[PDB]
């Protein structure tokens, strides 16, 4: 009979409650105070322009119909009470397929303060859409957005706000750093109004600033392309009469240049414009023909040649000048 007190409270609150109507429908606006706790920022799939994020999407509003007077003040209730009351229909504007986890029970909680304040947090994974400008790849940065707001309620029906200060309203957990390629720098939030045919809606935008780490692409693309150019430029140190020997340097370096040219764009999307890695490849693709037509010049004119005695110095020089000016203009942007 000790739990019959709390049973009579909850059956009284739901008695006459209409869950199809927002609180304060004819009097005021339903202020929904929200904040996000990011448990783990998941991997960013640069091929499909998207990022996975696992959040603790907390929301809080005020309902004056769910006021109670009892032996406690906060009602840490079960999950199925939340479907029997009004909840905001917050959806993500740039989501693509977000899952609400259900193992083992549905991962939601609902707390009802005695004055009518509610808390209602959800555990979600959100596969959002992050439009990126892969021009400076792989030395590029991206502010992947996450925009959420009400769906059926206009800015004269449900306005959103942050619970704490906007600096302290999106918190990223320290252990959750599931990015392997990028690097999370910080987060910034904002609020604004969007325009639609149905009306004006309050949107809530946050931006996650990411910087790509280039340590993968150095040891996969940049170093083997540099070693290919040096492998092409050692052909000037041989003799003129070794015609089958120097054409092996000529053919296989430009054939391993064009395989790396193909295989460096497989992870990229089908981008129409040219990235900064494509500029490094195509210039390095130009030195290996410049070594190849140098050999075709000296084979046509076949003592040591003045062409090989000049290309032994100029070819490592102009490759060094390009390498000095390419890294300076892109690592210091």
């Amino acid at each position, epitope marked *: 009979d000790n739990t019959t007190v709390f049973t009579r409270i909850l059956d009284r609150l739901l008695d006459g409650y209409d869950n199809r109507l927002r609180p304060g429908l004819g009097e005021r606006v339903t202020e929904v105070k929200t904040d996000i706790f990011v448990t783990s920022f998941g991997p960013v799939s640069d091929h499909d322009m998207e990022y996975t994020i696992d959040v603790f999407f907390r929301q809080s509003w005020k309902d004056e119909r769910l006021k109670f007077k009892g032996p406690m003040t906060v009602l840490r209730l079960n999950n199925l009470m939340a479907s029997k009351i009004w909840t905001p229909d917050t959806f993500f504007h740039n989501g693509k397929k977000s899952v609400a986890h259900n193992m083992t029970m549905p991962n939601k909680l609902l707390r009802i303060t005695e004055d009518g304040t509610l808390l209602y947090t959800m555990r979600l994974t959100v596969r959002a859409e992050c439009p990126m400008h892969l021009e400076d790849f792989p030395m590029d940065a991206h502010a992947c957005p996450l925009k959420f707001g009400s769906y059926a309620y206009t800015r004269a029906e449900v306005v959103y706000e942050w619970t704490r200060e906007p600096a302290r309203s999106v918190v990223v957990a320290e252990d959750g750093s599931r990015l392997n390629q990028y690097d999370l720098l910080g987060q910034t*939030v904002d609020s604004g109004i969007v325009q639609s045919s149905t009306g004006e809606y309050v949107v809530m935008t946050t931006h996650f600033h990411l910087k790509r780490k280039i340590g993968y692409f150095v040891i996969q693309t940049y170093l083997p392309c540099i070693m290919t150019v040096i492998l092409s430029q050692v052909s000037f140190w041989l003799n003129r009469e070794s015609v089958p020997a120097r054409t092996v340097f000529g053919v296989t370096t430009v054939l391993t240049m064009t395989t790396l040219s193909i295989s460096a764009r497989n992870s990229l999307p089908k981008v129409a414009y040219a990235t900064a890695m494509d500029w490094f490849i195509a210039v390095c693709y130009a030195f290996v023909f410049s070594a190849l037509i140098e050999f075709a010049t000296v084979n046509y004119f076949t003592s040591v040649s003045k062409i090989d005695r000049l290309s032994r110095i100029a070819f490592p020089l102009l490759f060094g000048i390009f390498n000095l000016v390419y890294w300076a203009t892109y690592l210091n942007r």
Partner: antibody
Framework: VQLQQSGAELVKPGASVKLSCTAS????????MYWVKQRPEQGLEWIGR????????KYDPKFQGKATITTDTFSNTAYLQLSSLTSEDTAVYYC???????????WGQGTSVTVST | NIVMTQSPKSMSMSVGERVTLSCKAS??????VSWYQQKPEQSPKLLIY???NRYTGVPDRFTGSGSATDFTLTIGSVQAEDLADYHC????????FGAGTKLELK
């Protein structure tokens, strides 16, 4: 709606002062209380904020250990507490609440402190 | 910490012309930048909550523009009831304020 503060006071340096801001027309438990320092012919200077739902209080870094706020829900009034006040802190103190977009929409009439002889 | 600079300190114009205030933050504040006036020996009030969002009761001549860093307050026609200095605040972090900008009439 209407925000009320008490009248001006004359205090000696090194003493302690008590200043109140009474709110009417709205409860304190849902909106923050913002208190701000307004020196004469000078700009504003925020000193601290109040979350009355849990008693959370965060102060300005300059005024740490200088001001203290208690808030009574029954009296509908928040209180100042200046422990080690000096003669330099001669200004007018304003009362404010959190607005629609974290602004300060409703303001009190302001109480001026005077530390002299 | 956040600092707010209001430029210039003071200016003098007559009734019925254009004035453009300036307020620049140290780092990124999104939209929560508030404009407060201070009539002499009265209490401050609210002009624009957020950026470019007029408060209730103020005239339509007051308008603002919002960005990441710089924020301007614009009055199309200065009237005889605007004898107040204007303070630019921020709310993306713990709130801070500028020095204000006084004005006077001939």
């Amino acid at each position: 709606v209407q925000l009320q503060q008490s009248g001006a006071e004359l205090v000696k340096p090194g003493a302690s002062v008590k200043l109140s801001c009474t709110a009417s027309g709205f409860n304190i438990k849902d909106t923050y209380m913002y208190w701000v320092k307004q020196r004469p012919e000078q700009g504003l200077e925020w000193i601290g904020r109040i979350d009355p739902a849990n008693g959370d209080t965060k102060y300005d870094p300059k005024f740490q250990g200088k001001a203290t706020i208690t808030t009574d829900t029954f009296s509908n009034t928040a209180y100042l507490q200046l422990s080690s006040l000096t003669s330099e802190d001669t200004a007018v103190y304003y009362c404010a609440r959190k607005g629609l977009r974290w602004a300060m929409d409703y303001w009190g009439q302001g109480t001026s402190v005077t530390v002299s002889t | 910490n956040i600092v707010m600079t209001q430029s210039p300190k003071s200016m003098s114009m007559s009734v019925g012309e254009r004035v453009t205030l300036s307020c620049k933050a140290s780092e990124y504040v999104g939209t929560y930048v508030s404009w407060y006036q201070q009539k002499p020996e009265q209490s401050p009030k609210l002009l624009i909550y957020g950026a470019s969002n007029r408060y209730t009761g103020v005239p339509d001549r007051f308008t603002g523009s919002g960005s990441a860093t710089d924020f301007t307050l614009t009055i199309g026609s200065v009237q005889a009831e605007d004898l107040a200095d204007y303070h630019c605040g921020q709310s993306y972090s713990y709130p801070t304020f500028g020095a204000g900008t006084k004005l006077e009439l001939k």
